[PDB]
């Protein structure tokens, strides 16, 4: 009486929603993970929702040679 | 600092532990009165004014009753289980923040501390049933241990979803992170599952086979006399209050509301209390409203309904967080 | 140093025990905890989070193997009805 | 001494031996955490080059950066000291308002925005030092210039406005 | 240790010693000169010193002996007390600072 | 001259007492000894849980809070509960399990001296510097560039265990999968 | 536009026959440099799985119940598709590694990367990952297709650690930027 | 009607939480020197408090002074321990 | 062979990028140069084997 | 003395007082083979699946406190790990 | 970023303390043992793990 998935895929899906709701919708929620991983970030780019840059978690050492500053030397003390 | 550290720790411990036990005593009085109003009756109204001394009468009666231990199996082992259950049921109050950082121990691993001390409390129940030297009561205490560990999995799976939102195990940070929104709205299915798990975790109805006397094989807690009954009962009410406090912390914004230090502290304490009291009321409300689930059905509910949904939510939620660039920072903030 | 003494206790479990096969399972748990405790303390001395990671996988694997060992004992006991060695 | 977090310290060890005379002296900064924090972006505005140079000096001499970067260490202390001297001579009342609020609010910068906006304005109008945070999302208002704060314990009144220079 | 990831989320404290040792081996050992790996020997000993500290322990045991032998020969007429030291370098305790410094 | 080195007690921000490690160490050994000389196996596992707690408490007090709590949750919370369930369901005659331990005592001494004398020589200084007049004190100071944003030990583990060392995680996952399938296949009627 | 550092990281040098193109090419590069034979080999290997199970049912019948064989074929067909796809990927990626004849792939890579240099785009593209996490991705999938018989892995990250000194791409770009400059003038 | 006597224990429970909150806030504030306390204290925060004590004597003490008093360069606490490294 | 050749030379790129003290990481430029040389020789050794043999010779 | 140490002592003290009262003041009188049967395998399964699933949840807790640095790459491995279990 | 701006001024103060106390332990060693014991063959500065401490704490 229970439908078979590989012969009639859609009929099985309706039965599982109605007769095994906890198992069926776990698979549906579990599959929404990958679905939003494919839809939203492309969607967000189009609307202009840009990703924030990472915050610094270490001292941000400036790239390049040292600037050769002249100021606040020892003669400036006192 | 200003005064002695030992004095501060004494006072802070006394301020959390002593009023906690007063609240646990009146949760038992409130349970009887709430079920009575629901049952068209009064509940305790004669032991003390308005029945306000009923729990103290109960405790003193049991503490002066004679204990009937087993057939000299062991003195230490017999009390060992009850002692463990009470101590570790009460140890979890030490990380509850009654305001930002207003906890006995403001711990960065606080959520894991609460999980650990709950796991150590299940030992006392199992070590009691064995020590009773009655194979009938052992099976009930065994079934009760199976239910407690299975729904411990439900609670720690639900809690993992909250940590993903806040990025921290500090109870304070979890509460501060809800100034944005109480987690009951974004994590509404999780809150419902967590509350159900907390009822099962406390051997409370409709999950109350441990104390059920009408069920033929149930009622492991029903053979506990005098001091041993006091140990187990205090531990259970203590866990009920703590599961309601932790539920408010994780989903109802903790101590958050809807200039003087004394009044700010009072309002934070009151807001946490109001939220905790509401969940205690619901906790009593479900015991009065439902019949009891069979052991085989309650294990099937955990393992074939709640856990498959939670593990599905464990996939979906971080995918949503990544997709919306809302993975929180894990540094000390808030 | 304590970790070394604990390894001896797990070792000594196999020396003193002729008939308790359950004690053999427990003595392996003692040995594995002793080795994990040694790694944890050394990882603290050498400021290395990899030591803590290694200890976490030992806890995972030793927990996994405890379950297999109990399952194997249950299949054994289903047919024999005893965990005692006649000696 | 080691950078390990202690767990069983019961004692403190001090050493009264001074630095050798060959090393030029320097007055250490005498400001507490909360004042330093209210003045951090101001120090960053004026001394960023010297701060970067000092850090780059150490990176150029791995394992030896404590020594042979001392002269560059001394500059960073003098520049920061110039900002805490200039602020204390021009914005003292507004400076004390912000760092006293910060010290009372878990040193959380988002709890003291009205006091910050008052100081930010006064500092800019006497020292030409302006607060800047690199790489804030261009599609939103900068978090420190937002009229409402989500994580603030007390709501920011609507008569206290952010300081945007040029307005 | 050698991993490069410390307890506080930063790098491990002996990692620079480990990188140096690997740097010395890769650039001084080869197929042509198997004796070039000899140069990497003091670098190895430094790495083991960072991990275990057996030399630094040995040096301080000796130095504490001489230090604690010099304090017995001398007589401390008035050594600073704990309270006064706690006042060292403070806004209104110059006398305690001067007394502790013997200035 | 003067006293160049000043040693004084810390008042606040003090720190834990190193005495409490010694009780935890001795309580772990006593509990360890009680495991292998206990008459009843269930009592042997109860002493094993005490051994787990003392080690866990030890790890917590030295600052290894995550792993210490992991021991409480994992080993006491689930492994030990599984051991007691099986032990307290099976038929055990304590008489059938008692070996004459006196016959094993000379070998016990010989094994203890032989093994200890070899492995102790292998312990690095970190584990042997403060066990068994002139004593050595450990010195600690602050850094600022390293303390910009501290991670807790659980965070520091999380930063690498899914990325740099995720092969270990995959290997562990397949071990957990084998255990679930295996333990099920051999116990339950198909 | 030369960054004066065309070899930023210490790579592993492996003795092979043909020049190394990329120690870790992007998934999409390995699909776009696939040959028609790679597809031919891909499905043919994928068909082998269910075909072998089918031949094992025709010669030595399994005596299974009514629907057992269809269930087994479904798993065999998926096994062959996974196995066939990994074989297709290995055949294309082995040419990037220099472990298979790759003259056609060397040419189009030299062309493709040179166009990016003069267009201004980065050689391997832009990544949402931190530079440290790009190193982790590079050190995970680097030469990883040689382990495909045990564990699969694919590079979906846009990192700058491809095992190759990148001076060759800048010399050509500069060299043919002047050729278009001289041609433009002579007009 | 409303059964108020049934609601009295809830009022007691709610009031006990308030007593703990108010009491813990007050004693912590007196301990901190009449100022609000700290929370989510990380290593940077702890180090800043030790630096505050070696300027004022109090772990919560504040000073806006641009010049450190004499002896500040000498009172950085190196912590000593006997076992756990 | 007495000389050990690293199977994982990329271990020179290991290390936490968080909470890095100034001057912590040693300079590795010579290490990088060592592997640039090893890569370039190998690429040149293949460049001549196929240009001289199997091409312009058969 | 840390507030956590005093808390543990006080909770232990409460338990001893309750035992002491009922041991000292409550009455006490001297008011004080076995068959066997097979046990149910479902009890072993509940403990086994709990333990193995308890370990996997434990292994995901570091990810929840490291989500920001892990970002997309660490999420992939977490999802691979979740899919396998 | 607030902590970043403060790091060099706090690091430089800690660096002078380490230099101060390292030179002092060097001078003490030479005046007590006659020469400086070499712990590391490298010339880099290594933060001490042990420290010579007086046999007794402060009296008060
Ligand atoms: C939701 C629907 C529930 C079922 C439907 C109820 C219904 O329709 O009954 C109609 C019913 C029919 O009218 P009636 O029975 O003829 O009553 C006429 C009397 O004259 C009425 O005389 P009265 O004195 O009862 O007048 C009530 C008046 C005066 O009553 C009050 O002011 C008391 C309420 C505030 C004080 C409560 C705190 C007391 C303890 C303080 C601290 C002590 C310790 C320190 O207050 C009100 O106007 C209504 C306030 C209702 C508050 C109910 C308390 C919370 C119950 C749920 C608790 C859950 C958490 C615990 O009306 C009532 O019973 C009165 C209350 C109205 C229903 C309120 C439902 C609120 C539910 C909230 C959840
Ligand atoms: C099976 C179910 C598969 C569910 C996964 C669906 C992926 C949804 C995303 C998508 O399809 O859009 C493509 C989108 C391409 O982004 P795009 O805008 O074109 O930019 C170009 C690049 O992404 C270059 O830009 P990039 O450098 O910034 O790339 C960084 C990349 C970061 O991406 C990565 O970190 C690469 C991770 C790839 C892992 C490959 C090894 C797989 C085999 C492992 C064996 C153990 O970030 C992303 O692109 C977004 C990806 C979000 C993370 C994906 C996490 C799911 C992977 C694991 C699947 C679920 C576990 C199944 C395990 C079952 C075990 C029983 O994202 C992907 O790269 C997908 C990579 C994962 C595909 C896995 C397929 C085999 C599994
Ligand atoms: C204990 C912790 C108390 C925490 C705060 C509790 C708030 C509610 C207080 C209820 C008790 C009020 C006094 C009372 O009713 O006692 C009646 C008791 C009599 O109890 P009763 O049972 O005979 O009451 C008779 C009234 N009927 C029967 C109609 C309901 O009178 C006393 O003797 C009081 C003096 C001793 C009080 C000891 C308990 C005090 C608890 C608060 C201090
Ligand atoms: C936790 C451990 C268990 C709880 C221990 C402490 C319980 C809270 C305090 C309860 C004290 C007993 C109740 C108050 C006294 C009382 O019974 O009043 C009615 C008593 C009479 O009790 P009664 O039993 O004769 O009255 C009968 C009432 N009906 C008719 C309804 C049955 O009042 C008196 O006449 C005598 C008063 C004696 C002096 C008051 C004693 C107070 C002791 C406080 C101890 C606090 C510790
Ligand atoms: C015997 C044990 C089981 C073997 C069967 C599975 C073999 C797995 C490896 C494999 O794919 O075989 C390698 C072999 C070799 O793979 P191949 O991809 O190199 O073959 C190339 C074929 N041309 C030249 C046309 C591109 O796979 C096969 O192709 C087997 C050939 C028959 C494939 C099935 C024919 C179509 C049937 C449709 C129905
Ligand atoms: C299409 C997807 C439908 C999902 C399956 C729903 C279902 O009905 O499964 C039924 C099956 C057992 O049910 P039953 O019909 O009684 O088996 C009789 C066999 N003759 O149930 C099963 O065997 C498997 C049920 C699904 C298991 C899901 C486990 C949690 C998944 C979390 C989400 C992550 C994956 C997405
Ligand atoms: C025996 C007790 C061992 C000491 C355990 C302890 O006190 O550590 C407290 C710990 C969390 O507290 P923490 O802030 O990390 O460290 C404070 C140290 N004074 O607390 C914990 O992490 C776990 C506490 C477990 C239960 C401790 C009491 C065990 C005995 C109960 C009977």
Helix F153-161 × helix J41-64 angle, to 10°: 90
- Across the interface, of K7, K12, K47, the residue whose CB is closest to D3 is K47
Any K CB within 8 A of D145 CB: no
Structure tokens at C12: 């000594």
Q: What residues of A are in contact with residue K4 (Cβ under 8 Å)?
A: 56, 59-60
Q: Which residue has the tokens 């001390």?
A: B117
Under a CB-based contact definition with an 8 Å cutoff, are residues F80 and F48 in contact?
A: yes
Contact D150 B334 (CB under 8 A): no
As a whole number of angstroms, the distance between CA J40 and CA B237 comes to 31
Q: What residues of F are in contact with residue E12 (Cβ under 8 Å)?
A: none
- Return the number of CB contacts < 8 Å for H and K: 12
Q: What residues of E are in contact with residue D3 (Cβ under 8 Å)?
A: 13
Q: What residues of C are in contact with residue E1 (Cβ under 8 Å)?
A: 43, 46-48, 50-51
Nearest ligand, CA G46:
5
- Residues in contact with F156: Cβ distance below 8 Å, sequence separation at least 6, in sequence order: C49, E5, E6, E7, E8, E9
Q: What residues of B are in contact with residue D152 (Cβ under 8 Å)?
A: 179
Cα F31 off chain centre by: 13
Which residue in chain D has the smallest CA separation from I23? D59
- What residues form DSSP beta bridges with F7? D13
Structure tokens at B227: 């001091």
As a whole number of angstroms, the distance between CA F17 and CA D11 comes to 11
Distance of CA H1 from the midpoint of ligand 1 (Å): 6
Burial category of F148 from C-beta neighbours within 10 Å (exposed 0-12, middle 13-18, buried 19 and up): buried
- Residues in contact with F12: Cβ distance below 8 Å, sequence separation at least 6, in sequence order: B1, B5, H59
Query: Using the 8-state DSSP alphabet, how is residue B211 labeled?
Result: G
Tell me if residue H81 falls in helix, strand or coil: strand
Handedness of CA H68, H69, H70, H71 (dihedral sign): negative
As a whole number of angstroms, the distance between CA C55 and CA F64 comes to 12
Contact I3 E6 (CB under 8 A): no
Q: Mutation test of the interface with chain I: which of E19, E34, E38, choosing the one with the most I Cβ atoms within 10 A?
A: E19
Under a CB-based contact definition with an 8 Å cutoff, are residues F128 and C1 in contact?
A: yes
Structure tokens at E84: 């006064």
Distance of CA G157 from the midpoint of ligand 2 (Å): 9
Top-level CATH class of C1-80? Answer: mainly alpha
Compute the nearest-CA separation of F41 from chain H (Å): 35
Burial category of E78 from C-beta neighbours within 10 Å (exposed 0-12, middle 13-18, buried 19 and up): exposed
- What residues form DSSP beta bridges with C20? C84
Kind plus residue range of the DSSP H or E element containing E39: none
- Residues in contact with G99: Cβ distance below 8 Å, sequence separation at least 6, in sequence order: G16, G17, G18
Which residue in chain F has the smallest CA separation from H47? F142
Which residue in chain F has the smallest CA separation from D5? F140
Q: Which residue has the tokens 């199976």?
A: B146
Under a CB-based contact definition with an 8 Å cutoff, are residues B124 and B83 in contact?
A: yes
As a whole number of angstroms, the distance between CA D24 and CA D43 comes to 23
Question: Which residue's C-alpha comes closest to atom 21 of ligand 6?
Answer: A23
Cα F188 off chain centre by: 34
- Residues in contact with B219: Cβ distance below 8 Å, sequence separation at least 6, in sequence order: B140, B209, B210, B211, B212, B213
Tell me if residue B96 falls in helix, strand or coil: coil
Burial category of D113 from C-beta neighbours within 10 Å (exposed 0-12, middle 13-18, buried 19 and up): buried
Handedness of CA H29, H30, H31, H33 (dihedral sign): positive
Domain boundary assignment for chain F: 18-186
Under a CB-based contact definition with an 8 Å cutoff, are residues B178 and B254 in contact?
A: yes
Under a CB-based contact definition with an 8 Å cutoff, are residues H33 and B2 in contact?
A: yes
Is residue A23 lining ligand 6, measured as CB closer than 6 Å? yes
- Residues in contact with C17: Cβ distance below 8 Å, sequence separation at least 6, in sequence order: C23, C24, C27, F36, F99
Any K CB within 8 A of D77 CB: yes
Neighbours of B188 (CB within 10 A): 11
Cα J51 off chain centre by: 11
As a whole number of angstroms, the distance between CA D27 and CA D77 comes to 8
Helical ranges in chain F per DSSP H:
19-37, 41-61, 65-71, 80-87, 105-119, 125-128, 153-161, 166-187
Tell me if residue F139 falls in helix, strand or coil: strand
Any H CB within 8 A of F91 CB: no
- Residues in contact with A24: Cβ distance below 8 Å, sequence separation at least 6, in sequence order: A13, A16, A17
Tell me if residue F7 falls in helix, strand or coil: strand
Residue E1's nearest CA partner among C44, F96, G69 is C44
Under a CB-based contact definition with an 8 Å cutoff, are residues G85 and G42 in contact?
A: yes
To one decimal, the resolution in angstroms is 2.4
Handedness of CA F145, F146, F152, F156 (dihedral sign): positive
- Across the interface, of F9, F134, F159, the residue whose CB is closest to E64 is F134
Contact I24 D64 (CB under 8 A): no
Domain that holds residue J39: 3-85
Q: Which atom of ligand 1 is nearest to the CA of H10?
A: 61
Last residue before each break in chain B (C–N > 2.5 Å):
258
As a whole number of angstroms, the distance between CA F176 and CA F182 comes to 10
Neighbours of C56 (CB within 10 A): 25
Q: Mutation test of the interface with chain B: which of H10, H11, H44, choosing the one with the most B Cβ atoms within 10 A?
A: H10
Contact J73 G129 (CB under 8 A): yes
Residue C56's nearest CA partner among F164, B158, J84, F75 is F75
Contact G136 F164 (CB under 8 A): yes
Tell me if residue F140 falls in helix, strand or coil: strand
Q: Which residue has the tokens 């197929």?
A: E31
As a whole number of angstroms, the distance between CA B208 and CA B214 comes to 11
DSSP characters over chain C = -HHHHHHHHHHHHHHH-SSBHHHHHHHHHHHHHHHHHHHHHHHHHTT-HHHHHHHHHHHHHHHHHHHHHHHHHHHHHHHHS--BPP-
Residue B96's nearest CA partner among B72, B113, B74 is B113
Domain boundary assignment for chain H: 1-85
- Residues in contact with E51: Cβ distance below 8 Å, sequence separation at least 6, in sequence order: C45, C46, E1, E14, F124, F126
Neighbours of E32 (CB within 10 A): 7
CATH of the domain at J16: 1.20.58.1610
Omega of the bond leading into B206 within 30 degrees of 0 (cis): yes
Q: How many residues does chain B have?
A: 334
Burial category of G130 from C-beta neighbours within 10 Å (exposed 0-12, middle 13-18, buried 19 and up): middle
Which residue in chain I has the smallest CA separation from G163? I39
How many structural domains does chain J have?
A: 1
Kind plus residue range of the DSSP H or E element containing G175: helix G167-185
Tell me if residue J48 falls in helix, strand or coil: helix
DSSP characters over B149-204 = HHHHHHHHHHHHHHHHHH----HHHHHHGGGS--TTTTTHHHHHHHHHHHHHHTT-
Phi-psi region of A58 (alpha: psi -120 to 50; beta: other; left: phi over 0): beta
Cα B48 off chain centre by: 28
Structure tokens at H18: 């308030």
Nearest ligand, CA B233:
4
Is residue B278 lining ligand 1, measured as CB closer than 6 Å? yes
Under a CB-based contact definition with an 8 Å cutoff, are residues B165 and B243 in contact?
A: no
Kind plus residue range of the DSSP H or E element containing B274: helix B261-289
Q: Are strands F5-9 and D11-15 parallel, antiparallel or unpaired?
A: antiparallel
Handedness of CA B42, B47, B48, B52 (dihedral sign): negative
Q: Are strands H78-81 and D11-15 parallel, antiparallel or unpaired?
A: antiparallel
G102 CB-side CA count, 13 A: 27
Query: Using the 8-state DSSP alphabet, how is residue I22 labeled?
Result: T
Q: Which atom of ligand 2 is nearest to the CA of B322?
A: 52
Query: Using the 8-state DSSP alphabet, how is residue E67 labeled?
Result: H
Handedness of CA K48, F5, F9, H77 (dihedral sign): negative
């Amino acid at each position: 009486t229970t439908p078979r998935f590989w012969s009639t895929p859609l009929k099985y899906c309706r039965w599982a929603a109605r007769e095994r709701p906890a198992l069926f919708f776990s698979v549906v929620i579990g599959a929404l993970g990958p679905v939003t991983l494919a839809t939203v970030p492309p969607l967000r780019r189009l609307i202009g929702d840009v990703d924030a840059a990472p915050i610094p978690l270490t001292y941000p050492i400036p790239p390049g040679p040292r600037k050769q500053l002249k100021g606040y030397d020892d003669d400036t003390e006192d | 600092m200003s005064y002695s550290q030992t004095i501060n720790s004494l006072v802070e411990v006394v301020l959390v532990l002593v009023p906690s036990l007063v609240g646990i005593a009146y949760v038992t009085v409130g349970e009887r009165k709430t079920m009575g109003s629901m049952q068209r009756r009064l509940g305790p109204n004669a032991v003390g004014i308005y029945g306000l001394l009923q729990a103290f009468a109960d405790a003193l009666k049991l503490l002066l009753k004679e204990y009937v231990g087993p057939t000299q199996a062991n003195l230490v082992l017999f009390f060992l289980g009850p002692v463990i259950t009470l101590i570790f049921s009460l140890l979890g109050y030490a990380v509850i923040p009654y305001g930002p950082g207003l906890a006995v121990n403001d711990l960065s691993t606080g959520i894991l501390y609460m999980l650990a001390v709950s796991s150590l409390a299940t030992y006392g129940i199992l070590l009691a049933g064995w020590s009773a030297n009655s194979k009938y009561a052992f099976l009930g205490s065994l079934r009760s241990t199976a239910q407690l560990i299975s729904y411990e999995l439900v609670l720690s799976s639900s809690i993992l979803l909250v940590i993903m939102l806040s990025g921290s195990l500090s109870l304070t940070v979890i509460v501060e992170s809800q100034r944005a929104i109480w987690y009951i709205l974004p994590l509404l299915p999780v809150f419902i599952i967590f509350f159900i798990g907390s009822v099962a975790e406390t051997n409370r109805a409709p999950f109350d086979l441990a104390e059920a006397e009408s069920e033929l094989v149930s009622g492991f807690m029903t053979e506990h006399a005098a001091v041993i009954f006091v140990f187990f009962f205090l531990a259970e009410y203590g866990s009920i209050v703590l599961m309601c406090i932790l539920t408010s912390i994780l989903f109802l914004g903790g101590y958050l509301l809807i200039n003087a230090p004394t009044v700010e502290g009072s309002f934070y304490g009151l807001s946490l209390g109001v939220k905790t009291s509401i969940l205690i009321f619901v906790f009593i409300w479900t015991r009065a409203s439902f019949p009891r689930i069979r052991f085989d059905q309650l294990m099937s509910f955990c393992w074939t309904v709640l856990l498959p949904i939670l593990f599905a939510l464990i996939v979906l939620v971080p995918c949503i967080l990544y997709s919306f660039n809302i993975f929180p920072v894990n540094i000390s903030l808030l | 140093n304590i970790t070394l003494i604990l390894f001896l206790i797990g070792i000594l479990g196999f020396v003193l025990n002729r008939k308790n096969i359950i004690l053999m399972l427990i003595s392996i748990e003692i040995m594995l905890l002793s080795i994990t405790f040694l790694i944890l303390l050394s990882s603290l001395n050498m400021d290395d989070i990899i030591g803590q990671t290694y200890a976490i996988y030992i806890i995972v694997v030793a927990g996994a193997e405890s379950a297999i060992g109990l399952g194997i004992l249950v299949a054994f006991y289903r047919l024999r009805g005893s965990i005692a060695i006649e000696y | 001494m080691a950078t390990r977090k202690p767990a069983f310290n019961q004692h403190v060890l001090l050493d009264t031996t001074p630095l050798p005379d060959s090393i030029p002296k320097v007055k250490e900064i005498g400001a507490s955490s909360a004042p330093l924090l209210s003045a951090s972006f101001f120090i960053g505005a004026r001394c960023k080059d010297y701060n970067d140079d000092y850090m780059q000096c150490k990176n150029e001499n791995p394992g030896r950066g404590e020594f042979e970067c001392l002269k560059e260490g001394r500059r960073v202390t003098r520049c920061a000291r110039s900002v805490l001297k200039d602020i204390n001579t021009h914005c003292l009342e507004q400076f004390r308002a912000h760092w006293q609020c910060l010290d009372n609010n878990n040193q959380q910068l988002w709890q003291c925005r009205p006091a910050e906006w008052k100081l930010n304005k006064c500092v800019y109008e006497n020292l030409k030092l302006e607060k800047v945070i690199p790489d804030q999302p261009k599609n939103s208002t900068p978090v420190h210039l937002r009229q409402r704060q989500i994580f603030a314990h007390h709501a920011i009144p609507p008569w206290e406005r952010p300081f945007i220079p040029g307005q | 240790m050698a991993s490069g990831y410390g307890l506080n989320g930063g790098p491990s404290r002996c990692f620079p010693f480990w990188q140096e040792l690997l740097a010395c081996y890769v650039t001084n050992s080869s197929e042509d000169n198997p004796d070039g790996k000899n140069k990497c020997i003091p670098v190895m000993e430094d790495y083991y010193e960072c991990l275990h500290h057996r030399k630094e322990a040995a040096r301080v045991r000796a130095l504490q002996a001489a230090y604690r032998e010099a304090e017995a020969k001398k007589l401390q007429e008035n050594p600073p007390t704990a309270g006064q030291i706690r006042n060292l370098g403070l806004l209104n305790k110059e006398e305690d600072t001067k007394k502790v410094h013997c200035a | 001259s003067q006293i160049s080195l000043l040693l004084l007690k810390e008042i606040y921000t003090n720190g834990s007492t190193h005495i409490m490690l010694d009780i935890l160490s001795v309580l772990a050994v006593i509990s360890g000894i009680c495991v292998i000389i206990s008459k009843n196996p269930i009592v042997s596992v109860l002493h094993l849980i005490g051994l787990f707690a003392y080690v866990s408490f030890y790890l917590i007090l030295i600052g290894l809070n995550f792993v210490g709590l992991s021991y409480l949750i994992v080993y006491i919370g689930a492994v030990s509960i599984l051991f007691l369930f099986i032990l307290m369901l099976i038929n055990i005659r304590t008489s059938e399990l008692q070996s004459n331990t006196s016959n094993s005592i000379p070998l016990t001494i010989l094994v203890g001296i032989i093994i200890s004398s070899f492995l102790f020589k292998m312990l690095p200084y970190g584990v042997i510097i403060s066990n068994q007049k002139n004593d050595l004190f450990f010195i600690t100071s602050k850094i600022w560039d390293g303390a910009l944003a501290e991670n807790n030990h659980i965070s520091s583990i999380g930063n690498i265990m899914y990325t740099n060392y995720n092969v270990w995680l995959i290997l562990a996952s397949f071990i957990l999968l084998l255990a679930m399938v295996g333990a099920i296949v051999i116990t339950i009627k198909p | 536009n030369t960054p004066t550092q065309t070899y930023q990281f210490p790579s592993k040098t492996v003795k092979t026959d043909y020049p190394l193109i990329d120690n870790d090419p992007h998934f999409t590069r390995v699909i776009r440099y696939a040959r028609p034979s790679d597809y031919a080999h891909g499905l043919a290997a994928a068909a082998a799985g269910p075909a072998a199970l089918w031949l094992m049912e025709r010669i030595s019948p399994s005596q299974v119940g009514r629907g057992g064989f269809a269930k087994a074929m479904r798993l065999a067909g998926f096994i062959g598709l996974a196995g066939g796809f990994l074989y297709f990927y290995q055949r294309s990626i082995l040419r990037f590694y220099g472990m298979s004849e790759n003259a056609r792939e060397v040419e189009m890579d030299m062309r493709e990367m040179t166009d990016r240099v003069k267009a201004g785009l980065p050689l391997y593209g832009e990544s949402r990952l931190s530079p440290a996490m790009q190193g982790v991705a590079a050190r995970q999938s680097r030469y990883s297709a040689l382990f495909f018989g045990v564990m699969p892995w694919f590079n979906f990250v846009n990192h700058n650690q491809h095992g190759v000194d990148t001076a060759k791409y800048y010399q050509q770009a500069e060299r043919e930027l002047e050729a278009e400059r001289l041609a433009r003038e002579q007009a | 009607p409303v059964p108020f006597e049934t609601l009295i224990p809830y009022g007691i429970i709610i009031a006990m939480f308030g007593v703990t909150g108010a009491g813990m806030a007050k004693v912590r504030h007196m301990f901190n020197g009449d100022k609000r306390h700290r929370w989510s204290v990380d290593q940077w925060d702890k180090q800043q408090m030790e630096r505050d004590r070696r300027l004022t004597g109090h772990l919560r003490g504040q000073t806006d002074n641009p010049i450190a008093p004499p002896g500040f360069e000498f009172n950085n606490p190196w912590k000593v321990x006997x076992x756990x490294x | 062979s007495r000389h050990i050749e690293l199977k994982y030379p990329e271990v020179f790129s290991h290390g936490s990028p968080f909470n890095v003290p100034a001057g912590f990481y040693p300079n590795l430029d010579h290490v990088i140069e060592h592997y640039r040389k090893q890569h370039l020789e190998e690429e040149e050794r293949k460049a001549k084997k196929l240009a001289a043999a199997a091409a312009a010779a058969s | 003395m840390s507030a956590m140490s005093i808390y543990i002592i006080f909770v232990s003290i409460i338990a001893i007082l309750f035992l002491a009262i009922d041991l000292i003041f409550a009455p006490h009188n001297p008011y004080k083979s076995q068959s066997r049967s097979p046990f149910n395998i479902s009890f072993f399964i509940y403990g086994l699946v709990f333990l193995l699933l308890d370990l996997e949840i434990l292994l995901l807790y570091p990810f929840a406190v490291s989500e920001y640095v892990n970002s997309a790459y660490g999420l992939a491995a977490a999802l691979i790990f979740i899919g396998i279990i | 970023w607030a902590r970043i701006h403060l790091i060099p001024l706090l690091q430089a103060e800690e660096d002078r303390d380490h230099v101060r106390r390292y030179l002092a332990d060097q001078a003490r060693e030479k005046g007590l043992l006659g020469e400086n014991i070499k712990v590391y063959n490298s010339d880099r500065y290594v933060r001490p793990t042990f420290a010579v401490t007086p046999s007794k704490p402060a009296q008060e």
